[PDB]
Structure 1
């Protein structure tokens, strides 16, 4: 009964509806070029993708109404992808305002850091628990959202695409991440000339060329097989890097 939670993962972020609406309004203020959006309609489409649906049965088609309302052209040559190093990627685009992560787009901004899910055959948002991607099920409202929007983002990228990776993780490139499983395989060689990785070093660990890490070799192989050039740089001093990006 009431002491048993449905799922293993965190539940919907508190005040999720109010937060998504408020973020939409704020985004349209910061980015007047997305001001045409009707934020109530955006919320209605977002809610519609998952309310009353079994949260292991969500599809990319469920999010298509939201994807349509959130259509946004960003400069295709100015895209920064990332994997497991969100804070530094966002700090970078806060300074370097001509480059964009997915979370700098309306749809990514709405969802960033939030969790949500519904309950099968009720109108209610589940604020207690939501599916864990590993322990429960992969086709859940959050995972499918990121898969859908990330595919579209990667498909739109062109020219030189950059990706920030965390050189302090055991898997610098992880093939089962959203970057590895969705984004890499949707970079189109007809549009994308080069994927350049920036491998961020942690602490005082600056003695190795992490572009030689086996997972980077793996990434390199995957990209080469898509007929896209691969480039890799070490960022040994991310503190100084960011300062230089601010004060070049």
Structure 2
């Protein structure tokens, strides 16, 4: 494990960008004003010719400004600890939007990149363990992405959490949700709908109305939002049951 940057970053970013422009999410999400080139100048300038750890929460502000899309009322989803589950359920924009569906999220998803001072101004060979930079440098991209996404959310929002992780509560201030989403939700949000995942054949850790979720309910209420919570709603249980068919909580009548 040495962190390997994405080869041909500009070309890959440009590809993804053009592809999304013309063919992805057309009626689910609006297009952005900026061409794929300017977005690049914007994304490049933020990290290039600077040291890997030489970045703040303001670095990519210009990019995120060009790249923000109006988000559909009531359809915005945040997730913690449940990447595969939340994304199957959200269903590629069809049921809910996730960051990964937005242009910015789509473009940069799974990509690895960093600066250097020497020409060319980005490092194509190696990249530092993120644990070695200042948090605001290491969070500077996806933190600002979350912030900007949460800011744009209107209506009901939905949040999917993991209620079975004995080592990690369903809700925590130190997650990205906790740090960058929940506190950035505007007064154009009305209700927070929490979906709690209860892993098949695993012990239930976080019940709804107790521990960290109650903690969360208090915060939601404090922000003058409406709040509700569900544990394993049907629609979701079945997604679950598909990968673990012979599972107990999937006994068909």
TM-score bucket (shorter structure): 0.7 to 0.9
Say if 2:220 and 2:227, in contact at 8 Å, map to a contact too: yes
Q: Per the alignment, in what secondary structure is the counterpart of residue 144 of structure 1?
A: coil
The aligned counterpart of 2:195 is 198
In the TM superposition, residue 136 of structure 1 has moved relative to its aligned partner by: 3.2
Q: Which runs of 5+ in 1 are unaligned?
A: 1-7
Per-residue CA distance 1:17-72 (angstroms, 9 max, x = gap)? 22211111111122444275411222221111111122323123321221232131
Q: Which runs of 5+ in 2 are unaligned?
A: 243-253
Cα RMSD between the aligned structures? 2.7
1:46-65, aligned counterparts within 5 Å?
Answer: 46-65=43-62
Task: Determine which of 19, 22, 32 is the counterpart of 2:15.
Answer: 22
Cα 1:213–1:111 change in 2 (3 A) is farther
Per-residue CA distance 1:62-112 (angstroms, 9 max, x = gap)? 212212321311213210111122222222222661521111111111111
Cα 1:37–1:148 change in 2 (3 A) is same
Task: Determine which of 2, 5, 28 is the counterpart of 1:12.
Answer: 5
Query: More displaced, 27-36 or 47-56?
Result: 27-36
Say if 2:200 and 2:240, in contact at 8 Å, map to a contact too: no
The aligned counterpart of 1:84 is 81
1:92-111, aligned counterparts within 5 Å?
Answer: 92-94=89-91, 97-111=94-108
The aligned counterpart of 1:177 is 175
The aligned counterpart of 2:39 is 42
For 2:44 and 2:131, the matched residues in 1 are separated by 24
The reply to whether residue 145 of structure 1 matches residue 165 of structure 2 is no
TM-score, reference length from structure 1: 0.82
Q: Per the alignment, in what secondary structure is the counterpart of residue 194 of structure 1?
A: strand
Q: Per the alignment, in what secondary structure is the counterpart of residue 160 of structure 1?
A: strand
Query: More displaced, 88-97 or 150-159?
Result: 88-97
Query: More displaced, 57-66 or 21-30?
Result: 57-66
